[PDB]
């Protein structure tokens, strides 16, 4: 229940996390400015934070940089976006791609996608080819104490796909999930035991809840479909006083024989680290630590076309601090 | 498939060497396609195994089955999950439709001796699906 969102300002209720007496000033710090949104009633703080995050994402999508140079240069479209985003303190639209068809900085009726249930896939999109590029980004976070033991060792998956197809395909994501393997009766091979799986808005919650069916309409462009998060009980890939020798950790940067050492802390920068050779910045591509392998992607379109799905697995170091 | 024919003798020898009863990581071949085995592919593999021999009548073992699945995945990019057998006791039918291989008793289902036997009706009748409709969805 924000009263006025200010960066530029745009009042939403006119009745007006900090607190100026009876008015709460809840805002986050951006790259150069703090988006303080005044509130007076018992508004949802989580809702305000989500609205601020959505606004930041929309600004990043529309403007490649988040600085004061664009605040004073793109006010014509910024004001329109702010007015359209939230009315009376209640946001209604948050899709940057969908919003790009009604508000431009360089106006017809709003697209029916916002009115329709599918607000994350613009209808009528046509391309010469139907290629969707996936990105299974690995995040290795290790919390090793000074005694030598690892306390917090969690790996969070991130399936980011750049869908570029024709029409409104309804992707049916299928992987080697442990729960799915157990339900189908194949709970004996390598299955990913994801403790927490966070699907995107395109993925239907009911389908996943029913029989672990991940069916959703992918959007046009790069977006995060699913975000797995499960604990890891294996030895660390890098031991600082262990990964497979077939994997190479490109751009190894262990922040404190081989590799350039430069003091800016001591940055142990290594270009290529063969397998078997303080925060580490290891990023070994083509290495799936969790062992989760994508099974199938049911690309179904009403028009009917032969899709060419693609995906790559990248293993990087997340909260890998020592 | 010249590669499959070449790998069949070595795979059979390795399975025979392993009795019936060190490196970490999951490397993936760059650009190698990975997908579940299809019914037609499973039928073709079963026919090739029957023609070449070494699989029909061989004593079923976990190590031999794992080695065969790994060899199949290496030579074809098929996930090692379609080579599943129905729960015992008795004859275990293949989990993947189209597979002509099945396990039959040779004498708790775990202690029962099983051997791989060719079954042409498996590729046409979904015995595993009929027995376990819940497992087939």
């Amino acid at each position: 229940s924000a009263s006025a969102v200010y960066v530029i300002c745009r009042n939403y209720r006119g009745d007006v996390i900090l607190a100026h007496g009876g008015v709460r000033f809840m805002w986050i710090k951006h790259n150069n400015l703090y988006l303080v949104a005044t509130s007076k009633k018992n508004a949802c703080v989580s809702l305000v934070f989500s609205f601020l995050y959505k606004v930041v994402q929309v600004f990043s999508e529309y403007f490649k940089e988040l600085e004061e140079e664009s605040i004073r240069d793109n006010f014509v479209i910024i004001y329109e976006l702010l007015d359209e985003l939230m009315d009376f303190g209640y946001p209604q639209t948050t899709d940057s791609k969908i919003l790009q068809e009604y508000i431009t900085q360089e106006a017809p009726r709003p697209p029916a996608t916002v009115t329709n249930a599918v607000s994350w896939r613009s209808e009528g999109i046509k391309y010469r080819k139907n290629e969707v590029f996936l990105d299974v980004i690995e995040a290795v976070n290790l919390l090793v104490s000074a005694n030598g033991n690892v306390l917090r060792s969690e790996i969070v998956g991130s399936i980011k796909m750049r869908v570029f197809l024709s029409g409104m395909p309804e992707l049916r994501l299928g992987l080697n999930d442990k729960v799915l393997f157990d339900n189908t009766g194949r709970g004996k091979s390598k299955s990913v035991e994801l403790e927490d799986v966070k699907f995107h808005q395109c993925v239907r919650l009911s389908r996943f809840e029913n029989d672990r069916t991940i069916s959703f309409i992918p959007p046009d462009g790069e977006f995060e479909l699913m975000s797995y998060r499960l604990n890891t009980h294996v030895k660390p890939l890098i031991w600082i006083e262990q990964f497979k020798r077939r994997s190479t950790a490109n751009n190894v940067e262990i922040h404190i024989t081989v590799g350039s050492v430069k003091w800016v802390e001591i940055v142990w920068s290594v270009k290529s680290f063969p397998g078997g050779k303080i925060s580490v910045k290891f990023e070994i591509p083509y290495f799936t630590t969790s062992g989760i392998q994508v099974r199938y992607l049911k690309i179904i379109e009403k028009s009917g076309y032969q899709a060419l799905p693609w995906v790559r697995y990248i293993t990087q170091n997340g909260d890998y601090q020592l | 498939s010249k590669s499959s024919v070449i790998g069949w003798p070595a795979v059979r020898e390795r399975m025979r060497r392993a009795e019936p009863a060190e490196e970490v990581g999951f490397p993936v071949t760059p650009q190698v396609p990975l997908r579940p085995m299809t019914y037609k592919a499973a039928v073709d593999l079963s026919h090739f195994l029957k023609e070449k021999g070494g699989l029909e009548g061989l004593i079923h073992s976990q190590r031999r089955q794992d080695i065969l699945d790994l060899w199949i995945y290496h030579t074809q990019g098929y996930f090692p999950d379609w080579q599943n057998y129905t729960p015992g006791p008795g004859v275990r039918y293949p989990l993947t439709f189209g597979w002509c291989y099945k396990l039959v008793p040779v004498e708790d289902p775990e202690r029962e001796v099983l051997e791989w036997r060719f079954d042409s009706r498996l590729a046409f009748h979904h015995v595993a699906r009929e027995l376990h409709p819940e497992y087939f969805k």
Partner: peptide, 18 residues
């Protein structure tokens, strides 16, 4: 080529599960 692992084609569904 591309850093972080070459992109690989994805399947359509579990062909072994019907």
């Amino acid at each position: 080529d591309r850093k972080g692992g070459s992109y690989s084609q994805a399947a359509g569904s579990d062909s072994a599960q019907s």
